[PDB]
Each structure stands twice: as C-alpha cells, then as structure tokens.
C-alpha cells in the first residue's frame, strides 16, 4: 500500500502462488521489484519486477535430483 | 495343414484348415491353427501341430512383452526378423511352417516363413500341404490391392480347394480379418464339412458289465 | 463433431449478436456426439444462468436424470455438480426447488457418490434455510452431521455447522448458535482459506 | 564469504563467478599494461586458452 | 555387504532403505468393491519436463497395474522384472499371473538380490493392484521383500497421514467412483500447490482390467472435486 | 576416500585416474609433430645406467606395417598397451583384409584404457603413448592417448615431464606446411633444447618416422639421417647458447 | 560406508551417485537442446586449446544411428563409451526388430545399464549425461536426456553441464511465449539461449550445432558454413 | 537361381532373376535377390534360401556397425572380407553363395566374388547361381572391356535372360540395380524389357 503499484499489480495472485516465502522475504520482493523498477527508471513497480524480484529473492534450491528422490 | 493369407486393400485376411494330424489320424477337428501373436498380428501354422503352437506363443509372448515396453503396437517385420531368427538358430528340427500377418502404423504386412527360417515378403503366400491349391486359386484369381469381401471370398476358395485336393487337412475354415482398427476372427468362419448327421440311436441297454471292484468315495466339500 | 463445433461457433457469435438465437441454437443442440450432447448442454445451462431463464433448469435436470450418466461418463458429475452449483450461485432463490432435490436424491440409484450425496442433502438444507424453514433445516442438518461426523473438516463441515448456527439464531434461541459458532470456529481453524467460507463465518 | 552463515536473510546477495568469459581478456589487458612490449601488443595467444 | 546385522537382531541397510522410500514421491491406493483406483504424485521440477514420456503408473498385463514410491530406476528394473516373470508364469500357465504369486515372486526377487554380497537392495515400496478373479486385490511391496495384502493405504513422504485419513475415509460400501474421489482427495491433502491435471498420474482396476487414466479424464475428477 | 577407482571424490573427481597422470609425469619425454606427409616421432631416452646399450629398450614401437607409437611413463604398461595395440591391428586386418584406420585404433585402446580404470579388481595403466600413422587415402593422422583414456587428433603434441616446453615449441611452427625430413630435425631441435642435462646427466636421442617418404610405413631414422639431425640439433643448441 | 558404489546413507542418500552428478556438472562444458515443431535443434560449447586439435577429430556430437543424434556431457572417456554402447544398442535393436531403434527406447536401454552400475557395487556410475535427438512417426521431434542415475526423460527443452538450470530458466521462460516454432525460430533460441547463459559471442568455430528435421530424417552437424550463416544472421 | 554382377567405369551394375524354387513350388516369383547392405553395396544370394538371409542380414549389421564407427562411408572390400570370413569358418554349415558389388571413395565402382566355399577374387564380372554354367562361357566370349552404364544394363538383361530361358530353376522378372554416385536405381524387366533371343 505504501509502496507505488500499478493497476498490473496482480498480488491477489502472487500470494496465491505456493511457496515458503516469510515476511523478510516479502519485504525483501517489494525492495529489489523497487530496484529494478529504479534500474530500469519506472515510475511504478511492475508485475515484471515484482516476478524478476520472486525469483532473485525466493527460491534458488535445487540438488533435490530426480534419482536423489 | 492348409495355412493362407493375403494382403487387400488395407489391411490382411488369414484363413486356416481346422486339423492336426499326430500321425495319420484327425487328432482334432477344430485345430486352433491361426494364433494372435500380438494386436494387430496373428499367424497361421502348420507342419507339427505342437512346434506351430509353442513357436506361435512364445513369439507372441515377447511381441508383447516389446509392445508394452513401447505403449505402441509392435510391427510385422520385428514379428518376422524373430521368426526367421529362430528357425535358423533351429536348422531345420522343428516342424511348424508359419504364415505371418499384421497389420501396423505402417500398413499391413504379410510374410512366409519356411521351417529353416526362409523368409519371402509376398503380398499373399500359402503354405501346408493345400498350399499347392491354394496358391493356384490366388494365381488364378488375385489382382493387387483387393478388396474385403471378395478378398475373404477367395482366401475362402483357396482354402477350400485345399481342403477338397490335400488329406490331413481340415474341416472347418478359420478366418481372421487384421486392419488398422478391427481384429475379426471368425472361429470357424465356414463349415464346409458339417458332420455326417448320425443315424438312429445305438446305445446299449441298462447294466452292461458288472465292476469287479467299486471305491466310491464322498470328497468332503 | 465438426458440425456440433460448428453451431458452437454460431452459438459463441450469436451470443456476441443477439442471446435469444444462440440460446435457441443450443437448445435445439442438447434437443438433438457424447462431446456434442454434453457440450451443449454446458453451453445451455451457461446461457440460462447468464439470461436468468433458470425456470427451465428443472425440467433439464429431471429429464436428463434418466440417460445423465447412461449416455456416457458416469463421472457426469461434472455436469451434476456445476449445474447445481450454478443454481445455488443464482441467489435470486425463486420458485422451483419443489421435489427437484427430491427426485435429485432419488437419482434412480444411479451414481451412489457418498460425497455428492452429502454435498447435495448440504445445499437441499442450506436451501431450507433460505425459504424461512428452519427447523426442518435443524432435523436434517444434524442428521447430516451425526452421519458424516468423521472428517468433512473444513469446508462442507463448516458450511454445515455454519448452517446450523443460523438456524438457531434463527429460532433455537442465540445460545445454541454460540455452541455451534464456536465449534465451527475452532474446526474451521485449519481451512485451506476459501474467501467464501471465511466471510460467511465471519 | 562463502554460503554457510548461520542465518542472515532479509539482503541483496550477489554471486562472484570465479571465471570470466571475455573480461578475463580485458583482466589480462589492464594487467599487461605495464611497458608495451616494444612490438606487437596483440594478447591473442593468451586469448585464446 | 548387507549381512552387517546391527548388535539388535535388525538390518540397517533395509531401514535405510525404508527411509529412503519414505522420502519418496506420495502414491495411494484405494480397493473399492468393483475395482481400485491407484494415484501418485507426478509433479514434474517444470514444465520444460516432457509430461508424456516418464510414465509413473504402469500396466504389467491386461488386468495387472503397479505403481512405486521411490527410486524411478530400481522401479525401472522391477517392473521390467515383474513383467518378465508374469509373462513366462503366462507361458507356462497359459493364463495371467495372479496377484498373489506376482508380488511373491517380486518380493523373492527383492529378497535374492538382498541376499548377496555386491548387491544393494532397491529403494522403492510398490502397490500392485490386481482383479484377478472376481476380487480385486491391493499388495504394498516393502523393500524387504514383504508383501502385505490392503484395503487402501499411501507411501512416499506423508503416508502415516495418508493412512490415517484412509482409515478414517474407507467403509466397505465404497464404488470406485468413491475410490477415485478418495484417492485425488488424499492426494490433494498430500499435495503442495495446484493439482494441474497432467502432473498427477492414476490408473485404475476393474473388470475392464487396469488402464491409466488419461490426461483428460485426471483432468475432469481434479476440476470435478477439487 | 582416494584409494580405489570406485571411490568418486565428493567433488566428482576420480582420484586414481589423477594418480595415473601423476605417475605419468616421471617419463622424460616424448614429442611428435603430424608433418602434411606423414607423422614424425621423438623421445628423451634417458640412458639410467652406463652399461646399457643402444639398440636396447625403446619408447616407440610398431603396429602394423603402417602405425607407429611412441610411449612415456611406465615402460611394463608402456611394453603391454603396445603388444595389445598390436594385436587389435592384427585382428582388424583379419576382419577387413586392410590395414586398420588409425582413428578406430585408437579408439579401441582408448576404450581398453577405459575398462581398466572403470573396474575395481584393476588399477589403470601407468603410462601414456602418442599414435602415428599416414595413408594417401588418408593423409597423415596422429592422436594422443592418457591413463584416463582421451583419444585426440593433434597435428602436434607431446606428453611427459617437458610436455608443456614441447607444446610452446610445437605451436612455433609451421605444422601444417612442412615435410619430415625437416620435421626431424626440429624434433630433434625440440628434444635438445627441452634436454636438462644439469639433472640427466646421460641421455639418448631416439627418432623414428612413418609418411609417404616410407610408403606409409613406421620406422626408425636411418643411421645417417639421425646423426644429422643431432648434429644439427647440437648446433640449435650452441646458437641458443650464444 | 557410502564410500562403495551404492550404499544407502542413514536415510538413503546415495552419495557416489551424487558425486556422478558433480562429475557430470565438472565434465567442463554446456549443452542445451531444444524441439521445435516439426524440427530439432542442439547447441554445444567446443574449445580448442593450444590451437592444435580442431578438425572433426575434437568435438562432443555423434550420430548414434543414420537418424539419431546424440550429445554428451562428461568425462570424455566415460561419455565415448556410453556412446559406443548405445551405437551396439541401436545396431542390435534394429539386427532383432529389424527397423531403427525409437529414442525412447535406446534411452531407456542406457538408462538401465547406468542403473545396474549404481546398482551392483562394482561398476562405477560413470560420470556423463547422454542426450538423444531424434524423429518419430508420430512424435516428430523427440528428444531425451538421460543421466547415469537412470533417469531416461524427455524435455520439449533441454540443457546439460554446469549452467543446465540457468538455461532451463531461460527455456522455461521462452517457451511459456507460443512454444510453436519453425526451423529458424527453433536455432534461433537454442543459439540465443547458449549465448545469453554463457555471455560470449560466438564465432563459428568454438560450438558444434546438429539438427534433425521431420521432411530430414537425418542427424546433421551443420557445418561452419551453415554455423556462421545463422550467427551473422541473427 | 542365376544372377550376374559386372563393374564398369564409376560404379557397377547388378542383375538377378527372380525366382527361388525347391525343385518346385517356385515360391517367392518375385525374390529380391539383390540386397542392399548399407548405403550402396548390394549382394547377390544363390543356394539355401534360409543361410544366405542370414548371412546377409548379419553382415549387413556387422558393416553397418562398423561404418557407423568409422563416420566414413563402406568399403566394398571390408564387405567382401567380412562374408569371406564367415563363410570360410562356417563352410560346412553353410551352402551358399555370394557376390558382392558396389561404390565407395578410395576405390569406387568394386564388384567382389565369394561363391559356395568363401574364396575371394576381384574380378571384372561375376556369375553365380544354377544358371551360371549356362552363361559363364557366353560372357567369357561377349564380354568386351569398356562397357559403359547402358552397355553393362544390355549386357546383363540378354546374358541373365538367356541363363532364364535356358534353365528351369530360373524363371519370372530380371531385377536390376544400378550402383554409383547417384545412388542405387532399382528397375525390374518384367516380360518385355526382357531380351528375347529366339
């Protein structure tokens, strides 16, 4: 709400994905999506920098290997 | 043993004589001498009854062990390279002349197979002793690309022909018509040879030969 | 096949243009292949639902009943289940209902689905409640719950409960509405959070 | 440091990759900028492996 | 290698095994009064994955299913196996394997090659299901090489749950299409994010003899109950 | 642990094999350069003890009347892995009625190569060798085989402890457009220079050849044609010196 | 005791098999794979140190049969055997069936060998990642990767070596945007994917790029002609 | 059975009957005779109908293993090497025949003979088959070096007919299979093409 989103915000979504993610790691989502968002001069966040900022902040486990399971 | 098959249109029709003879006797009347060796491929035997049925399942036993392992219908030609393989590994004991038939993703096919193994894909092949009459009656009447009705007429023809000019071949006629979706097998499609319907009865009175010694027993349930 | 697509088509368009003339071209479908039947008639129950002629939702369910699921997919469950969920979505609750859950229940004895057994009886009392009847909604509610007691949790359990405490706010006195309100609360403590359920618990 | 520090999420965390894909010619250039060779300056051999 | 019996009367490597198995990809199966339906998790790691190609549910005859939790080679060789030896019982009886003497012979084959020395045991428990006769038959396949006959039961990561919620669910009075309900239902419990209809895999066993549910029909139940 | 080829490193990495090439790297030296026309061959063969003799233990050898190999590292595994060469040239020529491609041989070796370090109740081969061979069908063909069993085709290279002087030098030429007959000589240029003789104290330079010039045949430098390359390598070496 | 071959951990674990995935991870390149609609497309790092080598003679792409192609990723030893393997596997399949082994099949067969290796501890996982490329009757562009732990699975796209998950991503990514492509747009994002996971432009030479169409039923390596066309094109 | 193989400049052309008897029961009218091995060798069976299939077909994954290997296209004389061996060990299993012929680089246009027995011979042209008596005289006398594509095709179609018509065992089609950069060009005489000497 604080932050400047934009009406492609489509969070009613992005909760909805499953995943492990804690309060850190929303705050840490809105900061590096405001990042990008900088990086790139937006003016409000995006859906695309919410998504790019799931990724760089969530995530990253692997080794789980098919064979492993 | 009379075996047949040939290849219409689109698909294949296989026609067997209905005998096996262990020795010079008509062992049976209704001989199973046409064998589902996978879905879409049956083959016809003959020679020994027993080397035609045992080569028959165990063929279809890994055709299908092939097939499941694919989730795809095996192939003609994997059904015949087996064969040939085999009956040459085995110079020449075995007794079973086998007439190969299917029909799969890439059309039918229809294949001989001699007991050495030989092999001769031909678009229709007879073999067993009718053999003979039979591929005069596919010489005299067979043009390419037949179609059903006629096609399972004349493989009828021929098989009757072998039937009427060949001792030790069957009564009745088995047919089985393979395409891309239909498996038909008519079991026997015709009865040339009905039964010589048994005039008044003959039987013997009641009580014809006392036993010596009785060993009734109730087996419990 | 291709032809049902094709009145599919004109049926999508004519819904564009003018409803009244895909709605007949899709009755005169489902009138009239098992993907074409089915199809048409999920296409027909939409246009009802969307024109608000759900008067003829009755007579579709009882005549359909006798081939739902003899034309095939007896899995037709499918179709079950979205047009009842579409019926109880139209909140303008007028008339029918009358011996339609009934014969419902009845069903020939043909799908025997525990599951939607319990879920149809859930929403016939549910129903109940809305048409000012509540003590039959009491009798049967509890005998849904004293028989499917053994899980249900979550979800249809709590709709039950939910269903109860509204009944006897209605006419058990406020009391028992707490006792069901808090057992409702607490086995609802551990929902998958449906916004539905949630806002009509709270 | 390396990965294992007990718990220290939020932030910003950035990999350093040990190899370079052309940078590691310019890393070889800016270390060659000591006293030209007195000829051919070209670093290609080094380039190339 | 395996002879090492701990100081307490137990085989260690097996309760590795047995953990192993454990963490294993969630299956369950329900036996219903005209068939059983078995489901597991097939969740692919993205949508890269061809799901079409490594199958998880496998028909090993006509009217023969069996499905794994665990290691997807081993799983690999034992139905290879499982085949094998129902198909020469076929050959020799001219008539398919039962239910019974398969899961012995599989669960002798998982004894002998537990019995060596160069050998490690598999890492998968298995569900055959059978309808052989007018009865239909549910086996899980331990690792030990035991095979213990079921009314419905789930492996893999959260199978105590999964068996409590079974115990809970079944009642003898249960038509497959129940079972099947069942099945997606405990799956779902055991599943984390949506149930897209390919990344689960099912196969059912009924007088129609065992079949795996196409995408289509796995799609229409998950829509259906979810 | 790194003590038997099953044991992966945790890194992936199996250690025998990395011994292998440990023990590899005891050998002086062995060089050879794929002339346009052939395939030329040379080695530091270190005399250990005065009262050998030439003619003696060598570390190149044939195979077939048209494939040559030079060896470096254990001179028993060096003796065996040029015998079973030997007689997988034999056997495909009994097979196919001609002389075998130099690149299915070395594939075969290199496979052999391979099961040896694969197998537990095995240790792999102490020693790696270099292939020469020519055909006018072919053109001249060289390949480099290791413990671990890669077959490359190089049209240079080497292997042993100078391996790396020998690769410089190898790339200071003109590989693709010169003749053996000079090739021999900056081989021996090559051996000499690369020579430490403050450590070696003895030495013996061993060349040998196989191209067109021999109708694709391997064989030692002549008499003549290997004292004048040494001579002229003596003399690289006294024009280096000064 | 995990040191043998196969020896399950406290709770399985299977720590040499592992240690075949980091070997497969350290064979010291890349390679990604892709299928189109009708057409399909592998890409793979190839260096020539010390300028010698070169020429067919170095190279990680091999045609298992006239109509499959494969690629490896791993200790190069290891990775040529499984390649010959896989050769007399084909060679065999089509001896006994008497047509061209499907890629699922010569897949499957590797895939079980590996499997026995980790299975009995006496043969080593041998540490590389096989890839086929093939066409079928009525599949068209298979391809298949499969791995020493047994895994046999078919990707529509696929990557090997030490930036598999990155390209994944990006494949991912992709082909989530109208996954039908032609011929061009199918080497197009395999050389674009390779390029961007690796951030270098690429020559001709340092890469080795096969192809297998439907109308093409052959496993072809393009040449630096066809290579370095397509680079400068795109 | 009877069949002929004859080389020419850049390639060589093949001819068999297409008959397989047994005494009688002339059976595969159509025999495919000449055969295929990998890419552009052909062979020509004569004798047990049975042991040349399977010699042939073992051959021919024997070779196209070995080409597979070498990335390199066959070589006629590794075919000929391969069934001389083969029948040179199992001579007395075996009562067959063959003729090799075919195109590769090194040495293109090549036509080998092992007949009954497994010997080896280079040779301009083969003759093999029951008919071979018959003909081996009239090609040894007609023959003449430089024949070109059609030369050798006439050659063939009048030496294989003549060998039909003057024994029983022989009898049907003449096929003919052309070898060389273009490939393999199968074509078959049916009851015109086929030459008519009295």
Same mark, same amino acid.
């Given at each position: 709400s604080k932050m400047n989103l934009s009406?492609?915000?489509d969070l009613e979504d992005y909760v909805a994905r499953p995943d492990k993610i804690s309060g850190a790691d929303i705050n840490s989502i809105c900061q590096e999506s405001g990042m990008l968002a900088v990086r790139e001069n937006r003016y409000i966040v995006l859906a695309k920098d919410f998504e790019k900022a799931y990724k760089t902040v969530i995530k990253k486990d692997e080794q789980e290997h098919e064979f492993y399971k | 043993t009379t075996i047949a098959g040939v290849v219409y249109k689109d698909g294949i029709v296989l026609g067997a004589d209905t005998r096996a003879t262990?020795?010079?006797?008509?062992?049976?009347?209704?001989?199973?001498?046409?064998?589902?060796?996978?879905p879409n491929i049956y083959c016809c035997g003959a020679g020994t009854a027993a080397d035609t049925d045992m080569t028959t399942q165990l063929i279809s036993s890994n055709l299908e062990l092939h097939s499941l392992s694919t989730g795809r219908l095996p192939r003609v030609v994997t059904a015949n390279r087996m064969l040939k393989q085999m009956l040459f590994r085995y110079q020449?004991?075995?007794g079973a002349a086998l007439v190969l038939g299917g029909v799969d993703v890439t059309g039918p096919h229809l294949y001989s197979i001699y007991p050495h193994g030989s092999t001769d894909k031909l678009p229709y092949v007879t073999m067993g002793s009718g053999s003979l009459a039979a591929m005069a009656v596919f010489e005299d009447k067979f043009r390419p690309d037949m179609e059903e009705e006629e096609a399972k007429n004349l493989v009828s023809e021929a098989i009757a022909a072998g039937i009427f000019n060949?001792?030790?071949?069957?009564?009745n006629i088995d047919l089985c018509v393979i395409s891309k979706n239909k498996l038909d097998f008519?079991?026997?499609?015709?009865?040339?040879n009905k039964k010589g319907?048994?005039?008044?009865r003959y039987r013997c009175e009641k009580g014809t030969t006392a036993v010596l010694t009785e060993k009734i027993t109730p087996l419990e349930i | 096949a291709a032809a049902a697509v094709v009145e599919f088509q004109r049926a999508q368009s004519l819904l564009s243009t003018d409803r009244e003339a895909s709605i007949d071209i899709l009755h005169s479908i489902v009138k009239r292949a098992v993907q074409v039947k089915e199809q048409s008639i999920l296409e027909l129950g939409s246009l009802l639902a969307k024109t608000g002629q759900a008067a003829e939702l009755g007579g579709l369910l009882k005549y359909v009943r006798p081939f739902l699921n003899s034309i095939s997919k007896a899995k037709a469950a499918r179709l079950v289940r979205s047009l009842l969920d579409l019926f109880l979505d139209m909140?303008?609750?007028?008339?029918?209902?009358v011996e339609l859950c009934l014969e419902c229940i009845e069903w020939?004895?043909?799908?025997?689905?525990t599951f939607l057994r319990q879920a149809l009886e859930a929403r016939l009392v549910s129903l109940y409640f809305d048409t000012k009847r509540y003590q039959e909604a009491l009798h049967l509610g509890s005998q849904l719950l004293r028989e499917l007691?053994?899980?249900?949790?979550?979800a249809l359990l709590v709709e039950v409960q939910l269903l109860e405490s509204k009944t006897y706010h209605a006419l058990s006195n406020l009391p028992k509405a707490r006792a069901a309100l808090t057992s409702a609360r607490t086995t609802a403590?551990?929902?998958?959070?449906?916004p539905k359920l949630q806002a009509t618990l709270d | 440091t390396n990965r294992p520090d007990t718990l220290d999420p939020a932030d910003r965390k950035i990999h350093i990759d040990?190899?370079?894909?052309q940078a590691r010619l310019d890393i070889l250039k800016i270390h060659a900028?000591?006293?030209?060779?007195?000829?051919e300056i070209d670093y290609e051999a080094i380039v190339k492996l | 290698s395996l002879t090492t019996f701990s100081p307490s009367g137990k085989l260690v490597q097996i309760e590795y095994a047995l953990a192993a198995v454990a963490g294993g990809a969630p299956s369950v199966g329900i036996k219903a009064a005209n068939g059983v339906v078995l489901a597991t998790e097939?969740?692919?790691?993205?949508?890269?994955?061809?799901?079409?190609?490594?199958?998880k549910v496998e028909p090993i005859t006509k009217h023969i299913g069996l499905v794994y939790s665990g290691m997807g080679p081993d799983y690999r060789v034992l139905v290879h196996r499982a085949r094998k030896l129902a198909q020469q019982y076929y050959l020799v009886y001219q008539e398919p394997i039962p239910t019974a003497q398969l899961v012995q012979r599989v669960a002798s084959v998982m004894q002998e090659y537990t019995q060596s020395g160069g050998v490690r045991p598999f890492g998968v428990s298995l569900l055959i299901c059978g309808w052989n006769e007018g009865r239909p038959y549910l086996f899980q396949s331990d690792p030990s090489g035991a095979y213990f006959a079921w009314k419905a039961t789930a492996m893999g990561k959260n199978y105590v749950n999964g068996k409590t919620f079974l115990e809970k669910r079944? !009642?003898?009075?249960?038509e497959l299409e129940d079972a099947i309900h069942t099945a997606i239902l405990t799956l779902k419990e055991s599943?984390?994010?949506?149930?897209?209809?390919? !990344?689960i895999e099912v196969g059912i066993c009924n007088e129609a003899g065992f079949r795996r549910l196409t995408p289509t029909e796995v799609k229409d139940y998950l829509a259906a109950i979810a | 642990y790194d003590l038997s080829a099953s044991t992966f490193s945790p890194d992936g990495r199996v250690f025998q094999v990395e011994y292998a090439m440990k023990a590899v790297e005891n050998s002086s030296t062995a060089i050879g350069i794929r002339c346009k026309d052939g395939v030329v061959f040379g080695v530091?063969?270190?005399?250990?003890?005065?009262l050998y003799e030439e003619?003696?233990?060598?570390?190149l050898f044939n195979v077939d009347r048209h494939v040559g190999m030079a060896v470096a590292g254990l001179l028993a595994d060096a003796r065996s892995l040029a015998d079973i060469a030997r007689e997988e040239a034999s056997n495909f020529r009994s097979n196919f009625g001609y002389n075998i491609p130099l690149k299915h041989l070395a594939d075969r070796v290199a496979m052999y190569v391979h099961a040896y370090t694969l197998y537990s109740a095995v240790r792999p081969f102490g020693c790696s060798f270099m292939l020469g061979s020519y055909s006018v069908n072919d053109g001249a063909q060289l390949y480099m085989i290791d413990p671990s069993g890669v077959s490359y085709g190089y049209w240079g290279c080497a292997i042993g402890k100078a391996r790396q002087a020998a690769k410089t030098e190898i790339e200071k030429?003109?590989?693709?457009?010169?003749?053996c007959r000079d090739i021999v000589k900056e081989v021996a240029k090559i051996i000499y220079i690369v020579h430490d003789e403050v450590k070696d104290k003895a030495f013996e330079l061993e060349l040998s050849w196989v191209g067109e010039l021999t109708n694709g045949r391997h064989e030692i430098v002549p008499k003549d044609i290997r004292e004048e390359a040494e001579k002229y390598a003596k003399e690289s070496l006294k024009e280096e010196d000064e | 005791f995990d040191r043998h071959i196969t020896i399950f951990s406290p709770e399985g674990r299977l720590y040499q098999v592992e240690y075949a995935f980091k070997a497969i991870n350290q064979g010291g390149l890349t390679s990604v794979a892709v299928r189109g609609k009708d057409c399909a497309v592998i890409v793979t790092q190839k260096k020539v140190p010390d300028k010698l080598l070169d020429s067919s003679?170095?190279?990680?792409?091999?045609?298992?049969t006239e109509n499959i192609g494969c690629v490896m990723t791993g200790m190069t030893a290891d990775s040529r055997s499984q390649v010959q393997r896989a050769r007399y596997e084909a060679a065999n399949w089509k001896y006994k069936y008497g047509y061209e082994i499907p890629v699922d099949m010569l897949c499957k067969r590797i895939a079980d060998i590996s499997q026995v290796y980790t299975q009995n501890?006496?043969?080593?996982?041998?540490g590389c990642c096989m890839i086929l490329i093939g066409i079928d009757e009525?599949?068209?562009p298979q391809v298949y990767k499969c791995d020493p732990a047994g895994y046999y699975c078919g990707f529509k796209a696929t990557a090997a070596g030490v930036k598999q998950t990155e390209s994944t991503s990006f494949l991912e990514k992709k082909v989530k945007?109208?996954?039908?492509?032609?011929f061009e747009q199918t080497v197009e994002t395999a050389i674009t994917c390779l390029s961007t996971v690796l951030s270098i432009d690429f020559k001709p030479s340092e890469i080795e790029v096969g192809v297998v169409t439907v109308e093409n039923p052959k496993f072809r390596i393009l040449t630096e002609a066809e290579i370095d066309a397509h680079l400068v094109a795109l | 059975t009877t069949i002929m193989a004859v080389q020419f400049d850049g390639g060589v052309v093949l001819g068999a009957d297409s008959r397989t008897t047994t005494g009688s029961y002339?059976?595969?009218?159509?025999?495919?005779?000449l055969t295929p091995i990998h890419d552009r060798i052909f062979c020509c069976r004569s004798g047990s109908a049975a042991d040349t299939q399977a010699v042939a077909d073992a051959v021919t994954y024997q070779l196209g293993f070995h080409s597979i290997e070498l990335n390199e296209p066959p070589l006629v004389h590794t075919a000929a090497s391969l069934f001389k061996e083969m029948c040179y060990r199992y001579r007395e299993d075996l009562m067959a025949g063959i003729i090799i012929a075919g195109w590769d680089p090194?040495?293109?246009?090549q036509v080998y003979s092992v007949p009954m027995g497994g010997m080896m011979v280079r040779q301009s042209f083969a003759i093999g088959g029951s008919g071979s008596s018959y003909i081996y005289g009239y090609v040894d006398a007609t023959y003449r070096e430089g024949m070109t594509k059609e030369e050798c095709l006439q050659f063939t179609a009048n030496a294989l007919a003549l060998a039909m018509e003057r024994d029983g065992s022989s009898g049907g089609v003449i096929r003919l299979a052309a070898i060389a950069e273009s490939g393999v060009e199968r074509q078959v005489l049916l009851g015109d093409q086929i030459p008519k000497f009295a």
């Open positions: 009406e492609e915000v | 262990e020795g010079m006797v008509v062992a049976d009347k209704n001989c199973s001498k046409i064998h589902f060796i996978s020449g004991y075995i060949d001792l030790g071949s069957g009564s008519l079991r026997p499609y015709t009865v040339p319907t048994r005039l008044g | 909140e303008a609750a007028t008339g029918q209902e020939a004895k043909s799908e025997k689905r007691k053994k899980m249900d949790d979550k403590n551990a929902i998958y959070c449906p | 040990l190899p370079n894909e900028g000591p006293i030209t060779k007195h000829g | 097939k969740k692919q790691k993205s949508i890269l994955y061809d799901e079409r190609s490594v199958h079944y !009642n003898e009075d249960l599943f984390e994010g949506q149930m897209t209809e390919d !990344n | 530091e063969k270190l005399v250990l003890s005065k003619g003696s233990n060598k570390r030429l003109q590989m693709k457009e010169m003749t | 003679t170095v190279t990680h792409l091999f045609k298992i501890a006496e043969m080593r996982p041998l009525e599949q068209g945007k109208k996954f039908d492509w032609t | 002339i059976a595969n009218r159509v025999t495919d005779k090194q040495e293109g246009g």
